[PDB]
Amino acid sequence: FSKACLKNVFSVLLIFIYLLLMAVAVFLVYRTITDFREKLKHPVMSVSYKEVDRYDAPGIALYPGQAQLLSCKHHYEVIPPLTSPGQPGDMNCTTQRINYTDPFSNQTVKSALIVQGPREVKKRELVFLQFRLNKSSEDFSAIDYLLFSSFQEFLQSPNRVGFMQACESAYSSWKFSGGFRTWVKMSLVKTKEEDGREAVEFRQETSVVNYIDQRPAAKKSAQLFFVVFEWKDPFIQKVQDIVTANPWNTIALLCGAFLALFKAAEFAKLSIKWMIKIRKRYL
Amino acid sequence: FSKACLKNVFSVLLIFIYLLLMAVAVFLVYRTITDFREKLKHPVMSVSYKEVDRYDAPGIALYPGQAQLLSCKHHYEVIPPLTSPGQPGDMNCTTQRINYTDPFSNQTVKSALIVQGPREVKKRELVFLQFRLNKSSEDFSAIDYLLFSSFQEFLQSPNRVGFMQACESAYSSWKFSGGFRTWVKMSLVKTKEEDGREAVEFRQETSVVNYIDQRPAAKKSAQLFFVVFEWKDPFIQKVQDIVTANPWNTIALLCGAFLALFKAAEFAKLSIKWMIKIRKRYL
Amino acid sequence: FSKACLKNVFSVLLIFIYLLLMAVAVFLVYRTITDFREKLKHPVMSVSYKEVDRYDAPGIALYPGQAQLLSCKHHYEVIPPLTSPGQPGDMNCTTQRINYTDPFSNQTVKSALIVQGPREVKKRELVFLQFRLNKSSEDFSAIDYLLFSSFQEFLQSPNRVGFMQACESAYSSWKFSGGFRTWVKMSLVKTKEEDGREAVEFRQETSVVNYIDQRPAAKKSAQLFFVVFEWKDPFIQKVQDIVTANPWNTIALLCGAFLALFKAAEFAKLSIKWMIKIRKRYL
Ligand SMILES: *[C@@H]1O[C@H](CO)[C@@H](O)[C@H](O)[C@H]1NC(C)=O
Ligand SMILES: *[C@@H]1O[C@H](CO)[C@@H](O)[C@H](O)[C@H]1NC(C)=O
Ligand SMILES: *[C@@H]1O[C@H](CO)[C@@H](O)[C@H](O)[C@H]1NC(C)=O
Ligand SMILES: *[C@@H]1O[C@H](CO)[C@@H](O)[C@H](O)[C@H]1NC(C)=O
Ligand SMILES: *[C@@H]1O[C@H](CO)[C@@H](O)[C@H](O)[C@H]1NC(C)=O
Ligand SMILES: *[C@@H]1O[C@H](CO)[C@@H](O)[C@H](O)[C@H]1NC(C)=O
Ligand SMILES: *[C@@H]1O[C@H](CO)[C@@H](O)[C@H](O)[C@H]1NC(C)=O
Ligand SMILES: *[C@@H]1O[C@H](CO)[C@@H](O)[C@H](O)[C@H]1NC(C)=O
Ligand SMILES: *[C@@H]1O[C@H](CO)[C@@H](O)[C@H](O)[C@H]1NC(C)=O
Ligand SMILES: *[C@@H]1O[C@H](CO)[C@@H](O)[C@H](O)[C@H]1NC(C)=O
Ligand SMILES: *[C@@H]1O[C@H](CO)[C@@H](O)[C@H](O)[C@H]1NC(C)=O
Ligand SMILES: *[C@@H]1O[C@H](CO)[C@@H](O)[C@H](O)[C@H]1NC(C)=O
Numbered sequence A, B, C: 001f002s003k004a005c006l007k008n009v010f011s012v013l014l015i016f017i018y019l020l021l022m023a024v025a026v027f028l029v030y031r032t033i034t035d036f037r038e039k040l041k042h043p044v045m046s047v048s049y050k051e052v053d054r055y056d057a058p059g060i061a062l063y064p065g066q067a068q069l070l071s072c073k074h075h076y077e078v079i080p081p082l083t084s085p086g087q088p089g090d091m092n093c094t095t096q097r098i099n100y101t102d103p104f105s106n107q108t109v110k111s112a113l114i115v116q117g118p119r120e121v122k123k124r125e126l127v128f129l130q131f132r133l134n135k136s137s138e139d140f141s142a143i144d145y146l147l148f149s150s151f152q153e154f155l156q157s158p159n160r161v162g163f164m165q166a167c168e169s170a171y172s173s174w175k176f177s178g179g180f181r182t183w184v185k186m187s188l189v190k191t192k193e194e195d196g197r198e199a200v201e202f203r204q205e206t207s208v209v210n211y212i213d214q215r216p217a218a219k220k221s222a223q224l225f226f227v228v229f230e231w232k233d234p235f236i237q238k239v240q241d242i243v244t245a246n247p248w249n250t251i252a253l254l255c256g257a258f259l260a261l262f263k264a265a266e267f268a269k270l271s272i273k274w275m276i277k278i279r280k281r282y283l
Helices: A002-038 A151-155 A162-169 A247-282 B002-038 B151-155 B162-169 B247-282 C002-038 C151-155 C162-169 C247-282
Strands: A044-051 A059-063 A068-076 A095-101 A109-116 A125-133 A142-148 A173-177 A180-192 A198-210 A223-231 A235-241 B044-051 B059-063 B068-076 B095-101 B109-116 B125-133 B142-148 B173-177 B180-192 B198-210 B223-231 B235-241 C044-051 C059-063 C068-076 C095-101 C109-116 C125-133 C142-148 C173-177 C180-192 C198-210 C223-231 C235-241
Touching: A002 A247, A002 B247, A059 A162, A095 A162, A109 A125, A109 A151, A109 A162, A142 A162, A142 A198, A142 A223, A142 C198, A173 A180, A173 A223, A173 C180, A173 C198, A180 B173, A198 B142, A198 B173, A198 B198, A198 C198, A247 B247, A247 C002, A247 C247, B002 B247, B002 C247, B059 B162, B095 B162, B109 B125, B109 B151, B109 B162, B142 B162, B142 B198, B142 B223, B173 B180, B173 B223, B180 C173, B198 C142, B198 C173, B198 C198, B247 C247, C002 C247, C059 C162, C095 C162, C109 C125, C109 C151, C109 C162, C142 C162, C142 C198, C142 C223, C173 C180, C173 C223
Parallel strands: A180 A223, A180 A235, B180 B223, B180 B235, C180 C223, C180 C235
Antiparallel strands: A044 A235, A044 B044, A044 C044, A059 A109, A059 A142, A068 A125, A095 A109, A125 A223, A142 A173, A180 A198, B044 B235, B044 C044, B059 B109, B059 B142, B068 B125, B095 B109, B125 B223, B142 B173, B180 B198, C044 C235, C059 C109, C059 C142, C068 C125, C095 C109, C125 C223, C142 C173, C180 C198
């Protein structure tokens, strides 16, 4: 009746209390393990993928030098035929300009043009950029570009100079050539270091397409650069410490270890009792 | 004797029965967990690789437009020197032609030429294709291609039109340029969605090689396209829900949780008995 | 006092002995499982990443044929402007030459030039190579290259001929074109087979940049090849058998299975005692 129900309730709450205590002990051991692992250098890391409905707009830092940005536009899955190559027109995108001292030599000041990238991967959104360089005594006509995760973070950055140097430290620098159109499909990788900081890196796939110049031969001295930026897939890659990335495996291992210790203690007590009984029976 | 053996057999079969019951309960809990997980959106997914002796022949959907397929051939690890570039000859491969309305605009009807790809990765099998385009008023001379997993599935597809649209929805579209030879190394990725459907995607690595035209200057108006398709490695990538991909980790976690619950119940019973005995001894 | 301390010490050492025995049994079962898995063909494999402070210098096997290696140099993050393209000069790197019969046809003897690659990824170390080919009646001007893990291993190899054939068996062969500069970012993948042997493979990302030739028109007959080699990131990928790569998950599963078996045995004994008591009470 009432007494049996009260006893059952007391037993259930005591079970819950002991479960809470066991969870606390297991969590403390896991916290100790993670604290030890965080101070290791070069640990083994695991990989995971996560799908996104829409991407945060990335930042494309271009280094045209003397080349003038002729045109930048947003398109969906297709680029309409060029109205007049080599002519300025239709320049309407979110762009910023930043000068910063190169972190590797300190002799050269890099001037970068930051462009907001595309967001809608599931609609094949494209950012199409056209540059024109009048003349250059240098060989290997190319424009260098760099990719970073967020344009908004750069916009609200307190420094905006150390941000660009930190971006240059990342391994996301490439070049695209003149006289060609480069289709770039970018992929996002995020690595979680033991300090808690996130390092963002970009993979790329490229398609290089020759450009046919029907402009007059007198106008062929200038060089035209065409580049297209889009997201390859809605999957973001995440590299994280193998123990920290999957806490549940370590929790299961620790629970098994504790239960094994309890079992071993019970067997030791049983063996002690057995030996005591054997000694008593013998003498 | 007989009685002891019978008792031992009964105990062993009872142990097996209880093990079956525990396995049934653990499987039911795992099934409930997976049913909950399947209705989540954008979960964390794990990656695995599997080696294959031979590949299923893929489907290469090319969009030449006005370009004529001059030649297609299968080679092993090397391509013999061209007998006569720009001339038709040696066109012998499994090819099919399909017209379908583009799923993104519905104004344009895409005409695709499907080619059966290579299978023997361990023999470096190559599919070599040569196209020729007489003239084109458009710039950016390129031919678009798409990759899908199985040519046989397309061959036996009941629709053959929705199949191509679904393939176009996948993120496996690229282009290759004229006046160059493009060596394409493809890699296969298969993603298992929670609905049970498999999404197939292709990664690519490209080598672009300039083509030297020794044909007469009067014949240089036409543009030549050369493309090579082969498998990069015998490893197929598989991306799957992290809980579903490794059921054994979840099984171990659930077994540990159940044993912890049993241990907690035993400790609660022991504590109840201890307190009852203490109360009896005190008064 | 002394007796209680001695009893506690004996109990603790017996607990340790039983824990050692349980660990031995679990390790034996895991060893049996791994021995069974090692004889499987095409198993499921997991992936992990490991960071490195510095890379072991790789081996770049180039196949110039009739092209002469004009220049090879080591640079950090930037290549100074060319003093005089097409002219020999500044050839100072660790290079070796090897002839070996091709393992696929045995009719052709491949002559390879091995170059020691870069090591310091965190300093963006670059290996820059320039070749010059006087004339060639063949089309598709390209130079084939292959990548292998260690130059030192090739240097101390007892055979040096079977080593190159085994390297050619690996899926790390590409080409780079003349009249262009190819920036190659390489990534290292190591696969552990069940036999214990390690297979090394290379991924690559390429940037192709057009080269502007201001040399006199009489000197344009020769073709110039420019290639740059560097490491993309300090992360090495490792693909290994899923059971062997994460032994701790299997250890946790086996510990849970053993504890479940012990629990089932205890429940069977309790049920046997219950039924015996019920039979005694009834009659
Ligand atoms: C495009 O440019 C025009 C003028 O250059 C501007 O008024 C318009 O807002 C721009 N649209 C977008 C989407 O950038
Ligand atoms: C940045 O440097 C460029 C020259 O490279 C020049 O426009 C000026 O010095 C700087 N621009 C601004 C807006 O500070
Ligand atoms: C360049 O200047 C920066 C900041 O003053 C310094 O940290 C770096 O060591 C310098 N590099 C040299 C002197 O090579
Ligand atoms: C530089 O480019 C402009 C295009 O904005 C062109 O009008 C001008 O003629 C070019 N300079 C020379 C010297 O041709
Ligand atoms: C190659 O083509 C010829 C005729 O064009 C045909 O008879 C032969 O069967 C073809 N072989 C292959 C392997 O496609
Ligand atoms: C497909 O379209 C092409 C024109 O693009 C033309 O051959 C014809 O209309 C269609 N071919 C077939 C076989 O239905
Ligand atoms: C194109 O037509 C298809 C099928 O009729 C339709 O689903 C799609 O919304 C249309 N797109 C438009 C009207 O932009
Ligand atoms: C079109 O290509 C064919 C090759 O099949 C060639 O004979 C013909 O002359 C070309 N057309 C023109 C107008 O040159
Ligand atoms: C560069 O070459 C010169 C002579 O060609 C040689 O003396 C020097 O040791 C070389 N340095 C390096 C770093 O290879
Ligand atoms: C290797 O072959 C080349 C010709 O391809 C020639 O130098 C010679 O036969 C061999 N060289 C050496 C050093 O054995
Ligand atoms: C080429 O020679 C090698 C070694 O003698 C042999 O293993 C291979 O089968 C040969 N290939 C042929 C005859 O096609
Ligand atoms: C071959 O190349 C050399 C450069 O070392 C050059 O001097 C020579 O003239 C070339 N041969 C011919 C036939 O031009």
